[PDB]
Design a protein around this ligand. Structure first.
Ligand SMILES: *[C@@H]1O[C@H](CO)[C@@H](O[C@@H]2O[C@H](CO)[C@@H](O[C@@H]3O[C@H](CO[C@H]4O[C@H](CO[C@H]5O[C@H](CO)[C@@H](O)[C@H](O)[C@@H]5O)[C@@H](O)[C@H](O[C@H]5O[C@H](CO)[C@@H](O)[C@H](O)[C@@H]5O)[C@@H]4O)[C@@H](O)[C@H](O[C@H]4O[C@H](CO)[C@@H](O)[C@H](O)[C@@H]4O[C@H]4O[C@H](CO)[C@@H](O)[C@H](O)[C@@H]4O)[C@@H]3O)[C@H](O)[C@H]2NC(C)=O)[C@H](O)[C@H]1NC(C)=O
Ligand SMILES: *[C@@H]1O[C@H](CO)[C@@H](O[C@@H]2O[C@H](CO)[C@@H](O[C@@H]3O[C@H](CO)[C@@H](O)[C@H](O)[C@@H]3O)[C@H](O)[C@H]2NC(C)=O)[C@H](O)[C@H]1NC(C)=O
Lengths: 48, 140
């Protein structure tokens, strides 16, 4: 139950393109990609 | 003893090409080097050229560059040679002979992650038995 409530009588500032949650995603996703990449076979024999 | 066969002798006009053929019984060219030799009466042997028994190499004595080619029938049962530009001083006994070689790596680098770098080459070991030969002469 990922509950949310509307706040009574509230407004709030937001700043798209300033939030760093996005930046966390940028490096988290990259890190994950590499995390699964790392345990794998190199193809450098194919440079022949 | 593998039978060897070669083209009949031929007279040719000056300034022009001739062609010869040879055969090995049992298709034994697959196991022997193809070679061609030239000789004139009263004169020493001259190597003309070769083909590897694998057929992956060919070559000529440098005197023949741009005048000679070597080809073979599929499955290498027979071989051929073409000579070009012949003149009256090219009259000679031509030969087809089988041959042997030693293949030794000439250089290497071991690679941990791939095939070793390698260089290889061929050294002729012996001539094998000679064909009966062909005679070619040039006249008007
Ligand atoms: C580890 O690496 C080494 C290389 O660093 C490997 O050795 C190399 O092996 C290749 C084959 O894989 C050899 O190529 C073949 O060479 C023979 C000629 O070589 C023989 O004669 C040598 C000379 O012997 C006289 O002289 C010495 C003094 O110098 C005296 O002591 C002797 O008593 C004799 O008087 C002899 O020394 C050679 O032995 C050496 O090599 C063997 C391994 O082969 C070692 O055990 C020994 O310790 C020693 O180092 C040897 O006995 C040629 O005849 C071959 O030509 C055939 O094959 C060609 C295609 O490759 C083809 O184009 C030719 O027409 C010809 O074909 C004929 O033979 C085929 C069978 O081989 C038939 O199928 C065919 O129908 C036809 O009949 C070929 O070139 C290298 O020479 C050799 N390296 C060196 C420098 O000698 C070693 O094998 C590797 N180890 C392992 C476990 O893989
Ligand atoms: C780099 O490696 C190559 C082989 O991959 C080496 O080639 C060798 O080079 C020398 C010089 O061209 C060749 O020597 C020849 O020897 C005969 C007789 O002694 C002499 O008459 C020639 O003038 C010549 O010196 C040698 O055969 C050749 N090897 C092969 C496999 O072709 C080269 O030496 C290497 N360089 C380094 C720094 O080691």
């Amino acid at each position: 139950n990922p509950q949310e409530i509307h706040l009574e009588n509230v407004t709030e500032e937001f700043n798209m393109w300033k939030n760093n949650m996005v930046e966390q995603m940028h490096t988290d996703i990259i890190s994950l990609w590499d995390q699964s990449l790392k345990p794998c076979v190199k193809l450098t024999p194919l440079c022949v | 003893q593998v039978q060897l066969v070669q083209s009949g002798a031929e007279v040719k006009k000056p300034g022009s090409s001739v062609k010869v053929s040879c055969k090995a019984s049992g298709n034994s060219f697959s196991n022997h080097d193809v070679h061609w030799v030239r000789q004139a009466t009263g004169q020493g042997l001259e190597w003309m050229g070769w083909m590897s028994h694998e057929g992956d190499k060919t070559g000529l004595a440098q005197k023949f560059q741009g005048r000679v080619t070597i080809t073979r029938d599929s499955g290498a049962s027979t071989v051929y040679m073409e000579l070009r530009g012949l003149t009256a001083d090219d009259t000679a006994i031509y030969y087809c002979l089988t041959g042997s070689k030693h293949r030794l790596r000439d250089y290497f680098l071991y690679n941990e992650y791939g095939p070793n770098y390698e260089e290889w080459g061929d050294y002729l070991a012996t001539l094998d038995v000679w064909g009966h030969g062909t005679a070619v002469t040039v006249s008007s």
